[PDB]
Design a protein around this ligand. Sequence first.
Ligand SMILES: CC(C)=CCC/C(C)=C\CC/C(C)=C\CC/C(C)=C\CC/C(C)=C\CC/C(C)=C\CC/C(C)=C\CC/C(C)=C\COP(=O)(O)O
Length: 374
Amino acid sequence: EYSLSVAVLADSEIENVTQLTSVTAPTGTDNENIQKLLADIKSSQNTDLTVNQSSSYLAAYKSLIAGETKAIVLNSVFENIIELEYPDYASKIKKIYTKGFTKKVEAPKTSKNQSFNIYVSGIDTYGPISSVSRSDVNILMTVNRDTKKILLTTTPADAYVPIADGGNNQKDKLTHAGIYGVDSSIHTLENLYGVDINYYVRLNFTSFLKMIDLLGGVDVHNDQEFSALHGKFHFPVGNVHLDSEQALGFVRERYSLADGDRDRGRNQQKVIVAILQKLTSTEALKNYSTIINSLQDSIQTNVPLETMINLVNAQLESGGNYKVNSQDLKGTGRMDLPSYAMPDSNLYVMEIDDSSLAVVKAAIQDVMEGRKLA
Ligand SMILES: CC(C)=CCC/C(C)=C\CC/C(C)=C\CC/C(C)=C\CC/C(C)=C\CC/C(C)=C\CC/C(C)=C\CC/C(C)=C\COP(=O)(O)O
């Protein structure tokens, strides 16, 4: 659910598209959508516009505010990209023609064998799940139902990788993929790790809170004393029970941890294991429908109902615990590499360590294939 519009400056005398002869747009990277809009304009308004190609939607916007063009095409998805460098962009423009588009995100891929991959996207925002934002949590869960093994692979938010789809396969921090959509994030990680991602789950701060509450909190073993959210929550060494708000702090704190983002990644993994322990309780399995009802409006997923039912009932009958292992893609922080989405800013990114990538890829394959980890 997105839209393309013809936009002009807020104070432009232009009121409707029939007054235009041309429009500036990135036909180099969004030609299909753009051409649909132009065909729709020619049909309902009998107006044929020539296109002044721009290198991107950001570039088109710059041209507009610079007075170098009268009108641009704007794909709503990319308004969120423009906002990264121009937070007040919305107030600078008006829209004089709008076309709604619709697309389903990733279709689910059913695995032909005992193993599947689920991508967990954690969005940096409160409120309705439909809110567009970057994906600061990017965890792949490789599950093998035969060996009863799970592998959690964390990819840091700042990982500098080719971003698929809207990212135009250009390098940027992984978290930006989330802005283009869950599709972009999924395809980005499929390409990086060379595996099919069967399903995804997408949730934000508000979704996470409801889930923890619903489950009655979660229990973890904390390895190092730390505090989160400017000292609001304190976590001692030892077994800790986390309510919704504590758990959210627990998975967010980074800077004060001995190993920074890597330790935060491990804390997130601890919480996932704890959630899984609650979700595979007999009470939870028996009452899965209530859990679906309770979380459906705040958590997006393409896992089919039929699949959930199979997974739940299989666990109900067979019982038995999954063993969980974890890993994280390693790299080196840098300030001198360009961000495709934010070309004018110096950003911190993590340049991937190639030897680590090889190891991470091999481990995913091992668990999928039922081989022991190195
Ligand atoms: C289905 C069933 C009952 C059994 C199936 C059999 C088994 C054992 C496994 C099958 C797997 C299945 C079906 C489901 C697994 C899913 C599962 C158990 C748990 C899912 C956990 C989920 C959905 C989310 C966890 C994500 C998590 C830990 C945190 C979310 C992160 C969020 C929302 C925000 C983080 C943002 C962040 C890192 C920092 C905040 O930003 P700043 O403050 O600016 O720095």
